[PDB]
Design a protein around this nucleic acid. Structure first.
Lengths: 203, 123, 45
RNA sequence: UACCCGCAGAAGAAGCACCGGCUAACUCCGUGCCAGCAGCCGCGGUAAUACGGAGGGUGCAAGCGUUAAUCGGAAUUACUG
RNA sequence: GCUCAACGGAUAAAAGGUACUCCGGGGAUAACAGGCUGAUACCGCCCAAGAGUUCAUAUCGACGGCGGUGUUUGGCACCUCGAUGUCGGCUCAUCACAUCCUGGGGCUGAAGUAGGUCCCAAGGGUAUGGCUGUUCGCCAUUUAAAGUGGUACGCGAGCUG
RNA sequence: AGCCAGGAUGUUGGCUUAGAAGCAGCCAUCAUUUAAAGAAAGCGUAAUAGCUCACUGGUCGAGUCGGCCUGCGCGGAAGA
RNA sequence: ACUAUG
RNA sequence: CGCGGGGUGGAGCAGCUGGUAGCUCGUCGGGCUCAUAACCCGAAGGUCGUCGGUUCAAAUCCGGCCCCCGCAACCA
């Protein structure tokens, strides 16, 4: 009812009922920035229909919203070239097969010296130098998730954002204080007193 | 004539006990420290607690040698063992606050005036 | 004052990691009648 | 100096812990498995004598409580037993 | 009547190893040094989109373009097969300049100190150790500086092995 | 060519921009003053201002401005 | 020929 | 690069001799059970990596391009 198109990427059904996880792409215009308030934990309270007792349970579930987004210069490399070690007569002793590329910005180096041809060894050691600079995009990328994600896990019990309470028959956005008493409005879909009044009041 | 790999005793109280020379400072190709000369050193033996630990690299100044110093009249002072005072790496002041054994007038300068106070004997 | 969580170092997504901490965890309630509801003592007497 | 005599005017002089049971002393309002309490059992998930505040009450009282330490209770190292 | 297809068809009938090797030959033909070449390599210049808050050229410089050197990997097979003994280390060097330090300059996005870049300059000078057979490299601690090359990648009728 | 004087008025042309006043970027093609001046040629301000050329009168007194075609030259141009 | 879990 | 092999429902495999796509698991729907798993019944689903040729017709024959394996890269 905001006209976005709404794929399922991935599911997992639970063995009895509902789902363990799901992933939902959202095609459309200013999507992310509507939904980005809804990242957080959500707290249900009801008498469970699965409990053979019939006890008030108090489950939790995440939502998490994240948007999508879509060669190394010869100046930056020094290329030492030198003789090999090891077995094979006059030819090993003399020629300089072996290469050692080095990146001057970082410090990462490479070799090759498997080959007889210097030019194979160079374009081989260029490959490993591509790979080993792609690998320090993962160790910056992964260590500037778990920088930002270590001090988001700081926030703890606050991480829960909404409280749906289907037997006392009401609700609360815990950040704003915005409240309804119409439970089956919001579950069928009619959220927007929460989603706007977050944005407006700034998460 | 301290040179690289020479082991010296430590005249001060700083913690160290034996040390090894590892450069003679102040020149290319420079062979020897005599008395009053700065050398870079490493600590080998060191007493269980004290200002400095085994493996620390720092400067020292040579204050006694077996080869001996010479005085303008031809006179020689020899000592019986090689020895040095440990110094900070940057300020080049002493670390030790006491000094054991005699020392020499060859120190007598602006720079090592703190030592020739603390010495028991200057020869 | 910072919750000390039982997850180790979080690596990617922290909300989904705390969801699986004892911090969250189903809270069920004692029935006061029927089917798990027996008290010996009762709150006062 | 103790001690004794004179002067003025109720004047200058009351708090601390507790009140679910063990354990003497109970009701409102807030709060809603949160905040907190707690020696042990345990209390708190919208009518809380158990949390926080109020009013009242019990117990000590120039002290009252908390903690630490020893013996007791512990016949739980038993000679008595 | 033969995929005698190695197709003018050696027999009807046949695969390997030699670092235990041997003989005859070849520089007709390879490995090593030299030679010709210069794709590659190294050094330089031309164009100037853009970067440099403003400003192409203080400093850089995309897309492309023209050269030099003979230094690296090659290409060729001209020299040597009735022998031109190989990497590194030691000893002793010697030349070039495309200069690492010291000397003289110009511009600076040069206040000063301290740097950046370019031009001139080859007189002298231009580490010691740890690890590795190592050259190279990494590391430690110095230095005014620890320059890049040529000399059969200088030097075994000089040493090492 | 040199030498002296003038290079203005609506107007910071408009739009962008924290600011954009000729002169970061984008769009663009006026009349007026008349000797003539770009709705701007290069320095320069945080921005105006500042300087200065196109343009124009004065002064001075004989050849001069810059393309095409062709000859010979210079730099580009470092090694044991 | 049957069977596991809550 | 030199030689050879392989890309097929969601997964692992068969079909490659040109005219016909199967097997076990998974998915979906129905049952049994208080419910789930097993078990019983029923139904679907494959551009045959990709581009181009050859043929009346290409998963299949043939070529280029891409990815994936294996073997070889020796004597100085």
């Amino acid at each position: 009812s905001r006209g976005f198109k709404t794929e399922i990427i991935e599911e997992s059904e639970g063995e009895v009922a509902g789902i363990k996880s799901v992933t939902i792409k959202i095609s459309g215009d200013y999507a992310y920035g509507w939904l980005r308030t809804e990242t957080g934990v959500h707290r249900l309270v009801r008498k469970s229909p699965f409990d053979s007792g019939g006890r008030r349970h108090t489950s939790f579930s995440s939502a998490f919203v994240y948007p999508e987004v879509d060669e190394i210069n010869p100046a930056d490399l020094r290329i030492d070239v030198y003789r090999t070690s090891g077995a094979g007569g006059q030819h090993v002793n003399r020629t300089e097969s072996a290469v050692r590329i080095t990146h001057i910005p970082t410090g990462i180096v490479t070799q090759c010296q498997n080959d007889r041809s210097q030019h194979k060894n160079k374009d081989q050691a260029m490959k490993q130098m591509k790979a080993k600079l792609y690998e320090l995009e993962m160790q910056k990328k992964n260590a500037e998730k778990q920088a930002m994600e270590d001090n988001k896990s700081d926030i703890g019990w606050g991480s829960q954002i909404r409280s749906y309470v289907l037997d006392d028959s009401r609700i609360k956005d815990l950040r704003t204080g915005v409240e309804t008493r119409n439970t089956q409005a919001v579950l069928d879909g009619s959220l927007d007193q929460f989603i706007e009044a977050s944005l407006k009041a700034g998460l | 004539m301290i040179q690289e790999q020479t082991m010296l005793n430590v005249a001060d109280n700083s913690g160290a006990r034996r040390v090894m020379c590892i450069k003679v400072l102040g020149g290319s190709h420079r062979r020897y420290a005599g008395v009053g000369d700065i050398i870079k050193i490493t600590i080998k033996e060191a007493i269980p607690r004290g200002k400095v630990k085994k493996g620390d690299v720092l400067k020292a100044v040579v204050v006694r040698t077996k080869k001996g110093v010479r005085r303008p009249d031809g006179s020689v002072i020899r000592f019986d063992g090689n020895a040095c005072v440990l110094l900070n790496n940057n300020s080049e002041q002493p670390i030790g606050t006491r000094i054991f054994g005699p020392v020499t007038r060859e120190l007598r300068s602006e720079k090592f005036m703190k030592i020739i106070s603390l010495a028991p004997e200057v020869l | 004052s910072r919750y000390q969580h039982t997850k180790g170092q979080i690596k990617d997504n922290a909300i989904e990691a705390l969801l699986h901490d004892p911090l969250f965890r189903q809270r069920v309630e004692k029935n006061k009648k029927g089917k798990g509801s027996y008290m010996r003592k009762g709150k006062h007497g």
